[model samples]
Target: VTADAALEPDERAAWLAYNDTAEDFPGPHLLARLDAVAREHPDRPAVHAVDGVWTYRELHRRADAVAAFLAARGVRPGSVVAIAATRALAPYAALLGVLKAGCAYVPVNPDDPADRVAFVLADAGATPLLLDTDPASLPAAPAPDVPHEPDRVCYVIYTSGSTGRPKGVVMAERAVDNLTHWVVRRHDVRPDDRLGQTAPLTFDPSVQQVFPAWATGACLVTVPDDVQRDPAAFLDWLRAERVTHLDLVTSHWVHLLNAAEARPAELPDLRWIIIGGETYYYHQTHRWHRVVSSPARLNTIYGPTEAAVNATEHLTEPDLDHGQVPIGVPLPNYRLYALDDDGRLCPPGITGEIHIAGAGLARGYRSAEATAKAFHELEVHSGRTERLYRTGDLARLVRHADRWALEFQGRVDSQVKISGYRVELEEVDAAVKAVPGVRDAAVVVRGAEQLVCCYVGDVPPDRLRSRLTERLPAYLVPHLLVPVEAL
Candidate 1:
């Protein structure tokens, strides 16, 4: 059962070629990348937050000071620090400081309940919870001297847990390093380029904003909290900042596209809007080229948090017809295989579960059992044992004359990607049924970015919504709740 044994000769050749395209990682670590950028452009703005702006050198110094502060508090390489995720300067500085100190920072989203945050902090064994936003409040000593190498972990992001809770995804320094280099070289980011930060700090894609901007000596523009919640204002803010690069969820991108059409807004400075975190609808991809009315490149990106920021990106062309768009090829150093249930590769147009293996894959989940379930060892045709991450995503390969492209089908599990966040319907069902007076429950996806709950309970819809909101993040709350007479 060799890996290539399942693939035809031509298909195997294509896979090998794709694997060869992965480049050798360039930077030593994330800190080195930031320091190098700051050395080149000390005065360039690094991040623009609600508090104010931080230049490359200024941001470096602030983070260094925070690192020193953490060091004095017993923080060092391999230590995990939990920070309250905010859209402002403090959390940003704390994150940089945690990394500079060679420690992993666990982000607790602001919308997250205290219990959930506590669970994340405890699960990751994080200490010295940072509820403050002031990095200046820490000691002004020099940065701690720690091993900021590629193997050291960068951060821990908690995603929707399949077992009715959340699991922390642990990514090492090399994970961020690969993504930063890929983004910088792929996009040719310049010192003048500005990356509009849309995803919340707790979300993994937020990593795309920080390291890529720093690695390329570009600015990271932080959208205001209110603006991020409002589609029209968010679009206006993107244009106002003259943002050159952005990463957005496909669902949210649709809302932004709608806003662009209604107001006739022009994003002249935008160079690339890379959308991911969900299946890309072909009709919407075609609409982007016709609606944006700009020369900006529209790319459909795909990857799970387990495989870093993105593993594949299909740059949209204006001539593309309205049909299913391919998810494109893998990121540099990434190996993707769509294998059938029997662990054999299928020919073009045959569906299979996607399994990703590469330098970008996470070390594993915080929970041992969970990690063993999703991430495990596999044998490639080369007879080499490689660690692989099961994506639970379904896709097929289709040949277009000479080129082979990966076509994304739906997921093979009950999990759904709503607004880039993973939601397990079974988890919701269990949670609802656990409520007092609830006899039965079922959770379903409503269109794209929402969940609908069908339950047989004495509790009303509003009351049920309120109860669920307290237990889960706001995004997982169902859009509509219906009282069913029976299951």
Candidate 2:
């Protein structure tokens, strides 16, 4: 094994081979894998939550029942079915039910405004599936009945609401299958393992927690939202359920670490501990591993919704040793090409846009122009043509000794030009963390005109700013610093 931490090289090579050879047909699809797993591990635990446990046979049976229920209401495959779930268990089963019937299920947050959920349901061109939420939380009428077809539309992702009213990012079984298959193989997910569900089912990361496990006979353990909300509850659930794999954003992980008075026994079984959804520096993740039992499987994954949740991953032990680390290579069946403004591949150590191509690439959004800009065909110098998705995030290939790894710079859109010198927000954040007495920092681009820093721990904002002023040049100094009692 390399000292930085990973499976023994031979184990990794074997793991990759096992993944590629498992499923050969695109027709079998993600749902078909579930059918097989249900048959294979009928008695094995498929899902376990605090309330109850479900064996594969029973879970599959429930899914079939739900499919029949939806089918009776004219739900068919390829139909976009909106699901407003209260929790991840029964709701996840119903999600499979929709897929089994050749339909897609859109999970709306039960806590969302009724009007907003109604908009998504209507826009999805399907009926709404209001889960077991309180009557006080529902719309007057949530029409969840939608037409189903194998090719109708199986994806039900909602648009970003940051700009305005959100729309649906819908696709079909073929595309969803591609995404699921790509990720399953890339991550080397096992059928016997369990994936922890921390993300809202509405989010793309939830797909990682749900279907990939269902399709492969792996157990999907859905932790309640409250556990994630309350530190004590989160620890209890993880320990009681024996969570094997899970994902968390940087901020949440930081909280978990801060609350832990000592090494946690709840995390002993955690195999695939992935840090994603934000810019978590190498040092931060390494600190997480030090407080845990195992270090070998800590992963740093990076990707936006445009591609799947994880397009890149650094599969190694959290290294408290390195100052900064690369995001490692492209995951299995995924290709990463760093490109400059002229569409030329960036040489090693050159910063450029990170373009990812893989089986899991999402179909463009509803707007034709927007879709076109997001998806394209790129010619790889060494391999066949790749369908590349423009990941707005910026990073570049760096030859760290012999192996190639990606060094994350920051987002392309988050950069600013002051006095004709372009400044990356991430660079400023990293430098701030390195400063004496500055514990941690997060830099956010607000209004596209100013940089805001949210700091945590002992130092006061004014004093931190003074220290930074002495350490950094004038152009690089943060425009705004907002400190909190703690992050």
Candidate 3:
């Protein structure tokens, strides 16, 4: 028998093979895997952008050109190269090119403040490519056969750290392989499926958009930044492009749902929808489902940047009355544990901190000391030391029929002190978002005495406050619930 933190015997047996072969793939490496897919589907469109379409063969050649350019500049195996995060076909080739050169690619948001971009480059120890460096400017030469290990760093993505600046989350080839294989294998994504690229290149979900499609010969679709921001236009564009797979943040998903409320109809083309990036709203899940109004399966994914992209996913069902949607089970070989303050697994319904362990786990932050603090060997019910990523998320479990389900309560750090009462900002924000017509809300502590709720919705300020008063205790309600045109 395995430990309580681990899966049961039969359940463990079902997914054990995934862990055994995270790195076992057809190609020599990640880029080589893409080349194989491209060769198999040369004429198939690999990238559908606002600029134009790029076939698998064309994308492969462009990536080869990018690799030749980088290699000419002395880039070698395991080198760290930074590229601007652009919403164009260029980044697609650039990303694969960095991998082809046997170097890790770091995406720096060109739109972000210059200082922020500068900080990310310095922190990751990456060299920025020139602004005008696109595929056409370079020669389409084969990439140098730089020898590299499978466990070497694949990419480094920066996430907002507690210290105000961004912290670099480093991942390896095996971590990426685990994610790409699981999605393609479990979902059976085909070359005919068109995946909408909704997330920014700087975000981790963008990797989900790129590799799965690239590896499976599926088409990657993108829209102009302006079109993406306009909800109605975005929906229209998705329909026009025949996007079969889409991934977006929960808040953005809510916005799209709200937009589609007027004319709800079945979207025959969209086969899969995965929502993550923030705590999902079960309170509004039913509302969103109706707007989804399609046969497409809606999956709620949960994970932090420390893990590749997603650690767990729960398929939303219309019949299930689970109060708040649980974060669901671990992916293939991933393990999740909700431990109380004392580091013991909590009984069902008891709140505890969520810890994650799996092949998707990153090499950790750039600094060895910081990585040591975050990724540490912990003694769990397994009775052996296991490396765990302690997600600050405070969660709990519920006995559902036969299997136990995990639920996200709020972040452990979400508690704020105001007027001598400890208030959970997460609770307040969730409550505010639950109000009718409210799209989203964020709670900010005003100094030490007052908490303000800034929300985007049509609901009037007075009514929003009244709604919160009816649902929460006096101390728990925010001092101000200001309605905004947008948050």
Candidate 4:
């Protein structure tokens, strides 16, 4: 029994038309696009950091050097390369080089705990590439004209898993190519555009920060860590750098708005401000329009790692007064469906789990069981079977002007977003229980972004937090650790 069978013919047709976002692109892989861009604009600035800037030709050549080194080290096509590096040009060059060498790169933040980094490397069966190794000193090789294979895995990103471990989401090159090309066209990225790189290397949003700019021969400016930590400094840097495009989490934007409200700043050259990774509200838009007063267009995007970096986006209007903002329609070659608990397609205005399908769908998780549980083969329409990723996120379709848009309702599971990072309550619970002197533990979200852990343990709150900080990422550490008699 298919879910779409319940939809009326007209409703189904309208949905199909909305999902028909397919468009042809110039290449099957992002590296191919980057090569073309480098050849066309060899002297243009490709990446800019506080230290220095790299021209398109220099960046391509550096990546070729890294690729040659990886090839000499016996890394073969389809292998995984682990990148443990801080935010810098060498890591970015190494990423491209890994792809050029016909391998996938799994990025591990060097600041992460030693055990966590080790676990990721072991789980992926990847070859390590330390930042200390200078790829620039390596012997350069001519770029290989490899055959286009869209199905090849390009990168694997790890996300918080419920089973007391992290699971890697494997994304294919074609999916990334689709996303990069779509972003380039949607944002109208130009050679003169300076896109901000604010997302951490470990997060998937970093992919958006890097690829789109390179694909369009634009400059990717890495926002200094100190500036990123301070909203005022971040705004000053944006204006100083003449940045055209900026992508940030919803929380970061709110902080920036708060800072701007107190101290006025103008960004005349800013063209696009993209917000995602958390629920965005209409009041936030109201604040941006009133406080920022910049001509930049505000867009809210949404997607899980399973659906690539972003699957849906909404171009926000300043006049919108609703409490919750819509995540908007699907990106090119992607289909979003809201399905009820009974496996039936939901009509407009009813909440249901979001099921995503199409070109953006990831190859699956590194864990076979996890992949099978999340990715499903279903007949969404009569006589058509598609591979769909069940996003545990809840949303409903609503009429927006003449088209349909998705309004995010909360999550259907215990997973919560803390400062834009996804954390599974069960994973935190497991960590808390693992602490000595803890009898049992349960973690829950206290407010919009607070994680409060209630535990029946003899361990003091301070010790529990201190211990958890060492084991988990800073974001996963409970905001408030509470000791209770029993669950």
Candidate achieving the largest lDDT: 4
Over 1-487, each residue of candidate 2 has an lDDT whose tens digit, in order, gives 1111233455334323322322344547566677788888899888766557788887766666676666666765556776755553566566666776667777776665455566777766767643543222222222234443444455678744232335466555555665577557656778767888876677777777777787777888877866886766676676677777787665566667655545453476667766665445556666656666642276777776666566677765454556565677665556776777766666556788888776556666655666677788866443446688887678866655466677788776754533222456666787688777667888776643366788865777778777776655444577777876666
Error of 2 at 95 (Å): 0.6
| Tens-digit lDDT track of model 4 for 42-88 | 99999987668999999889888888788777887899998755567
Model 4 ranges off by over 4 Å: 27-29, 144-147, 429-467, 478-487
lDDT of 3 at 126: 89
* TM-score of each candidate structure, all chains considered together: 0.92, 0.71, 0.80, 0.91
> How many angstroms is residue 486 displaced in model 1 relative to the true structure, after the best TM-score fit?
7.7
Residue 347 of model 1, lDDT score: 60
Candidate 3 lDDT tens digits, 296-381: 77778888889999988777776653377777767766777777776766555778888888788999998777687778767654
Candidate 3 achieves a global lDDT of 0.75
lDDT of 1 by residue, 1-487 (tens): 6866867787777666655655886445667868888888999889998879988777888888888888776766788988777777778778888888888898887677667777888889897446644664665666777753558888888877666457889999787788888888777788899998888888877898778898878899876779866888988887888999988887888788777667767788999887776665557666666667566787778888888878887776667656766788888888888877877656667888999988899989889988988987767666656688988899987764356678899888777666556776776777788889889988877677667888998999989888887877788777788999986
Ranking by TM-score: 1, 4, 3, 2
Instruction: List clashing residue pairs in candidate 4.
Output: none
Q: After TM-score superposition, what is the CA distance of residue 372 in candidate 4 from its true location, in Å? A: 1.1
| Model 2 C-alpha lDDT versus the unseen true structure | 0.64
Each candidate's lDDT (Cα)?
Answer: 0.79, 0.64, 0.75, 0.84
Pitting candidate 2 against candidate 3, the one with the higher TM-score is 3
Clashes of 4: 0
Better by TM-score, candidate 4 or 1: 1
Q: Which stretches of candidate 3 lie over 4 Å from their true place?
A: 1-29, 130-132, 281-283, 415-487
